[PDB]
């Protein structure tokens, strides 16, 4: 949906910030989800295969995005972290 796409866009923007890069998000190719449920925390680890332009050249990347929810956290929807971003 919007959400898997939003996470892939987050991944590209976080990579661009971390690596001083100008990758342009094209699309999500595929997504795998792993879910955990602790007492209050619930976690999804997203394994995102995405296409992004590197100086106009379309390339494939795998991004690992960790999305953590707690019902007491009210400033944002959740906490999101880019863990890994690599060409594939």
């Amino acid at each position: 949906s919007l959400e898997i796409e939003e996470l892939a866009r987050f991944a590209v923007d976080e990579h661009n910030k971390k690596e001083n890069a100008l990758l342009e998000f094209v699309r999500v190719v595929k997504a795998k989800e792993q879910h955990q449920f602790h007492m209050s925390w619930t976690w999804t680890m997203y394994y995102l295969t995405l296409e992004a332009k590197d100086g106009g050249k379309k390339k494939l990347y795998e991004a690992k995005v960790w999305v953590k929810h707690h019902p007491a956290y009210i400033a944002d929807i959740n906490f999101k972290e880019l863990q890994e971003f690599k060409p594939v």
């Binding site: 602790h38 007492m39 953590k68 707690h70 019902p71 007491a72 956290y73 400033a75």
Partner: protein
């Protein structure tokens, strides 16, 4: 781990993270606190960042005597700020004495993050504890008596956040049953919204009967400075 090594692990994690919370401002970091101050370079830089004062020129020479000269510049500077250095020598820091290195970093945290705290005419560690007690007084599921067991269930940290920034946290959703989750919540909120890096390992805090109080005071002092 238990006792002294368990507290050493906690001090290594928290003191490294505290040092990094300052060194990032100067465009650098340490990784291994047992190694990364031995040459004195990042120790002198840490002191410049936290003091806003200029120290003598660091020596980038590779020999033990260059490194002893750098660490002596750091210790001379700390002594100049009214700190009575007991059982700390430059040679032992350069030679990688872990316990003395941690003791030196604690002396720096105490002098520059805690000593000048003044709350209701109460100074330093006792002023910080009084502040924590005042801020958390109305939270009946919190009882701040110390800088160790009182913080283990994460509610004290979450209450400090709610007390100042109720836009960030719905305290009503919390209870004592998930101490690891509660510490992680406080740390995630503080890192994202309060510019306080994560400095505790929640599992280590919860699983140690008495956590290290120097590490807890270090982290709690960051909340004091954020909210002061």
């Amino acid at each position: 781990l238990l006792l002294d090594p368990a507290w050493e692990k906690q001090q290594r994690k928290t003191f490294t993270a505290w040092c990094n919370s300052h060194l990032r401002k100067a465009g650098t970091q340490i990784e291994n606190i047992e190694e990364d101050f031995r040459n004195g370079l990042k120790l002198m830089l840490l002191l410049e960042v936290i003091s806003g004062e200029r120290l003598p020129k660091p020596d980038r020479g590779k020999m033990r005597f260059h490194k002893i000269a750098n660490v002596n510049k750091a210790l001379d500077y700390i002594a100049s700020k009214g700190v009575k250095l007991v059982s700390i020598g430059a040679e032992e820091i350069v030679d990688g004495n872990v316990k003395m290195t941690l003791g030196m970093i604690w002396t720096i945290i105490l002098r520059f993050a805690i000593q000048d705290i003044s709350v209701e005419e109460t100074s330093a560690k006792e002023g910080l504890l009084l502040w924590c007690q005042r801020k958390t007084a109305p939270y009946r599921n919190v009882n701040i008596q110390n800088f160790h067991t009182s913080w283990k269930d994460g509610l004290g940290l979450c209450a400090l956040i709610h007390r100042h920034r109720p836009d960030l946290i719905d305290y009503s959703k919390l209870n004592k049953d998930d101490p690891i989750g509660n510490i992680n919540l406080a740390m995630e909120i503080a890192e994202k919204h309060l510019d306080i890096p994560k400095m505790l390992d929640a599992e280590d805090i919860v699983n140690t009967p008495k956590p290290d109080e120097r590490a807890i005071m270090t982290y709690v002092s960051c909340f004091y400075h954020a909210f002061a």
